[PDB]
Amino acid sequence: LDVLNKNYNLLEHMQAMRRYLLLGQGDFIRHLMDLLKPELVRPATTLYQHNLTGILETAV
Amino acid sequence: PREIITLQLGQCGNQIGFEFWKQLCAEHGISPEGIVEEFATEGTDRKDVFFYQADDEHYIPRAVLLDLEPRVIHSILNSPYANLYNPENIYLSEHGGGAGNNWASGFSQGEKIHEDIFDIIDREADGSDSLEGFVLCHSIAGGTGSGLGSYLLERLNDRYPKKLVQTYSVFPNQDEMSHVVVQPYNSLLTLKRLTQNADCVVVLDNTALNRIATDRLHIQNPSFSQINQLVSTIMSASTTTLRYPGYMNNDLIGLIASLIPTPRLHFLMTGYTPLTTDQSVASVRKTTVLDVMRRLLQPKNVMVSTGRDRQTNHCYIAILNIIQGEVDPTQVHKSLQRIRERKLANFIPWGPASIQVALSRKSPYLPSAHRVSGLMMANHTNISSLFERTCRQYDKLRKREAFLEQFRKEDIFKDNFDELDNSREIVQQLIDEYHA
Amino acid sequence: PREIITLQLGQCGNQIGFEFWKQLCAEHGISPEGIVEEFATEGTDRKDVFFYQADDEHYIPRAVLLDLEPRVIHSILNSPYANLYNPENIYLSEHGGGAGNNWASGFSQGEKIHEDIFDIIDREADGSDSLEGFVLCHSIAGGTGSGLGSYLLERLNDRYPKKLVQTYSVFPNQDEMSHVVVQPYNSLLTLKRLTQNADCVVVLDNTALNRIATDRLHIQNPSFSQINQLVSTIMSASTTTLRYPGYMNNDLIGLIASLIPTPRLHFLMTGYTPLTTDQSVASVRKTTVLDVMRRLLQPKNVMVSTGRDRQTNHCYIAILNIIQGEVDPTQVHKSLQRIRERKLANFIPWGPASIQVALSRKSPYLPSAHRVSGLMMANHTNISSLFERTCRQYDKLRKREAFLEQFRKEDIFKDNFDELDNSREIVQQLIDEYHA
Amino acid sequence: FILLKPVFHCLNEILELCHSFCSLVSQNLGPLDERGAGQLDILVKGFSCQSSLLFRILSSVRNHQINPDLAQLLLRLDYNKYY
């Protein structure tokens, strides 16, 4: 349990996944879901993924 | 993102917002001229929601302060918290105003400085491409905050139509009528603009301030230096879901949406218990959350002068109970368990009610991470007693021939007095009709 | 190799090029009269691209400066940076000119000094056997830079046909029309030569200068000593791929080729954010590249007076975003990732668009190797608002009988006024037609 | 190297087809000649022989079990192409 704390932060990732998949802190997801709605109102195309990667990066 | 522009205005609205920004630096772990502590980012996870976003880690306040009286701003620059304020966002040095004491003064001064009043306050609007709204941190007492504040409730309704409007307005004092006598006139003129030209208000009574200021605070001569202590804490308490990282109703359009039943019914009762510093020596023994919300619905912490025997025919519709800091959340559902057994809130017989409880972690500070805090945002239909108090003091003054010849010389040609009287009775009749 | 001859001309064009050469010595690590630092070759890998190549490690500027007014050159020789300039390349001591204030003065003086004006400026042309081109560092304001500058745009088009022409021309000020009144006449006569007798321009508005000069610079009385500070940095910023060692678009015919859609559509919008010295104390904490290009497309750093509500029916076609110095290039593709999600640039519906980003290492200097710099070279089709502003001020003046009898006595026999009006409307119609 | 046979043959076919756009323009007053438009008509086919062959790799980039560094680069020019 000490080698993860020095190098990998294993159970810190247990808390970090709760903020995105369990949606613990809402400001990460609300500033997401505000910008994220003008893309979700249209049907998805093959041009969908490329602006979804940096609508994340302007949200984080 | 969620940037709100505060509109501090008037003789009393500038002083209650001065220590509101001064409260925010002590909890963010920041200094008004520098950054000496590292507690601002590890302890607090969000800071750019009321401040302007940083250029040198200097969180500029998104604030504007206009007043006709230069006395309120000359007691600011000698304080060491004024260097955080900017001398180019609002005014430079030696700013002035009118003479001046009239509701018709600031109502007529809005369209002669119309070019300058819509120039520098709009520069902060396009800083963020998703503006939250506007809060008018103004006053009802006097003619300074009530005269000019009624103008911006009209022209910002159509120029910025998709923005939230909601104000923390303070009510004036009705003890004697010697120093001021124009109090029934300028109050009802702004109160009409607070219902149809404004969505929500947060009422703050003055006669209920000295009820609390002699309750536990133990003063003999009531001064104006105590009016900023009860007000600045509950202002920062109302944004604990918004400033500190919360999940549900973490926006200002989140909290107000879950409490307003209908337009022109938005007057929210406020409550806040912990104001005593010698409680600190006995909170070390795990003082729980099971006893802090039993006294919120009990009419002891209220800031609204209302009748004590008028609560049996009135019914609560929406009640907010905000706990902060250390909550011990394994018993917060246990505190809400005990609500249905007492029925301390009368429930509306036509529809459901709601007791909403929420939590957020407080500042990394020793008086904040130790003592439980309870903020109440009630909505009870006994608020017409204040509207019956203001209207009975309004029609009695017009039969005494008071300020009918001294008030209609400037910019008033027709009788707009019953235009305020019927619309106030429309509020008072639809409140009692709302529980069928 | 890639030698460019700058054509500094006029009352304003000589002063903006004087500190342009003065900026180049502070970043090359050289002195105008000697070489005291060894940072010129180990830090900077290329120096002979704007300077003349060395004979004694004295990098002579490849510059010529002609003006009718002797006042601009008499404020040069007392400065210690004039010994780098040569008194035989342009003029010796006591050079003069006209009287003189007219567009027809310098237009008629070009063919009476025709032998001398094409003698000493051609001696620098055959120094390198592969000449890059000519940049006319001239002015539009006044009759000095606009009168003589229109002549060299014609006779250098055929005598040197295979050379790049592109100018950094400054636009005049349109606030009041009391000191000068000949401003609509001399501007449109040069603006016709800037589209058909010239390939590209770089517009620099004067009414947008004092928008920035009071934004963050905090001045009370606007003087002419601030006009050289915003201009000389972006001139040296535009040649960072050309002076400092870059790879792609490292020539002046590299940058301009990737932005011009078509001839007579070449007016490029410029933007440059970092101009404040107290930002330096907070750039020590790894200020990234992810936040510096979010504000370039946001209309805050622009130097073009354009409409704010006219950007919805106009579309960007080419946008340049130049980062300099410390870039941290592992996140420069991360900055371009966030561009498609906002769509802050409206894209043309007929063809593709392009957001080009490039980098080059800056000077080995402490204010240069620490703070991020962003240079913008936009191309947006809302530039007809300036052309609608100049044309509406042009036809209104001809109906007031202004300068129709006072202007046609010398060397003007026919009405060439509608020759400028239709060709300006040809530009304004083909811009809106360009997005089908 | 992006792919062994097709993309390297697609890429050298790009640089050959715009190399005859050099030698077509390089005549005296190119676009007014009959040979200027006659040599052009083969090239307006071969240029869309290259964008459509670039279009054929993008379907192999979306339907993806091949290579991530291939896919991240070729789409980076492709939203820089189709946007």
Side-chain angles (χ1 to χ4, degrees), chain A residues 42 45-48 50-51, chain D residues 62 72 75 78-79 82-83:
Chain A
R42 63 159 184 166
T45 51
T46 175
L47 272 305
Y48 186 72
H50 76 274
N51 53 17
Chain D
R62 176 171 177 275
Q72 186 49 252
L75 291 175
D78 192 48
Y79 58 76
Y82 289 153
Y83 309 128

Side-chain angles (χ1 to χ4, degrees), chain B residues 129-322:
Chain B
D129 298 321
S130 56
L131 191 71
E132 177 85 1
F134 296 122
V135 48
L136 285 87
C137 225
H138 72 93
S139 208
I140 310 296
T144 49
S146 185
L148 198 145
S150 305
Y151 174 63
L152 296 155
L153 286 164
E154 300 169 310
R155 293 307 300 169
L156 297 167
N157 206 357
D158 49 355
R159 290 173 72 255
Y160 292 93
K162 277 161 176 114
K163 283 64 176 190
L164 175 71
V165 84
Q166 173 218 348
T167 171
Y168 305 96
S169 277
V170 285
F171 277 170
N173 171 260
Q174 284 169 333
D175 284 339
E176 311 92 304
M177 203 73 100
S178 59
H179 168 213
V180 95
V181 74
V182 74
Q183 191 184 348
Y185 279 108
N186 48 19
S187 54
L188 201 52
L189 271 157
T190 318
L191 275 186
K192 188 196 181 61
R193 311 299 199 273
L194 281 184
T195 72
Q196 49 184 82
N197 280 327
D199 163 70
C200 189
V201 306
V202 175
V203 299
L204 284 164
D205 206 83
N206 221 340
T207 48
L209 272 157
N210 322 311
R211 187 179 288 182
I212 310 173
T214 80
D215 208 302
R216 296 143 77 198
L217 256 172
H218 301 93
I219 62 169
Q220 235 39 33
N221 169 277
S223 55
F224 196 72
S225 54
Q226 282 62 249
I227 211 168
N228 348 61
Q229 288 159 6
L230 204 123
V231 162
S232 49
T233 72
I234 58 171
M235 278 162 89
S236 75
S238 50
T239 172
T240 52
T241 52
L242 174 74
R243 163 191 58 236
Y244 296 135
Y247 182 44
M248 284 302 182
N249 297 322
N250 74 280
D251 300 332
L252 204 81
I253 53 159
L255 297 159
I256 306 303
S258 195
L259 300 166
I260 287 189
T262 198
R264 90 176 46 99
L265 181 51
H266 48 85
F267 319 98
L268 301 161
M269 271 176 64
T270 317
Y272 199 84
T273 60
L275 297 157
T276 305
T277 54
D278 342 86
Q279 196 267 356
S280 50
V281 304
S283 62
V284 286
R285 58 167 190 87
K286 174 48 189 143
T287 315
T288 183
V289 76
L290 294 172
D291 70 319
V292 296
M293 67 164 66
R294 304 182 309 175
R295 67 181 72 101
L296 302 183
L297 253 55
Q298 174 175 14
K300 187 64 214 86
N301 54 359
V302 301
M303 335 180 172
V304 159
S305 28
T306 172
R308 282 309 167 256
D309 52 39
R310 315 185 73 254
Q311 292 195 37
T312 149
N313 319 337
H314 293 129
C315 296
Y316 284 84
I317 175 162
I319 169 69
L320 209 75
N321 303 83
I322 298 302

Side-chain angles (χ1 to χ4, degrees), chain C residues 230-248:
Chain C
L230 204 123
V231 163
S232 49
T233 71
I234 58 171
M235 278 162 89
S236 75
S238 51
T239 172
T240 52
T241 52
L242 174 73
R243 163 191 58 236
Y244 295 135
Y247 182 44
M248 284 303 182

Side-chain angles (χ1 to χ4, degrees), chain B residues 25-38:
Chain B
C25 12
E27 55 183 350
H28 277 308
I30 59 170
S31 172
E33 93 296 311
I35 310 295
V36 324
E37 290 296 327
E38 53 72 28

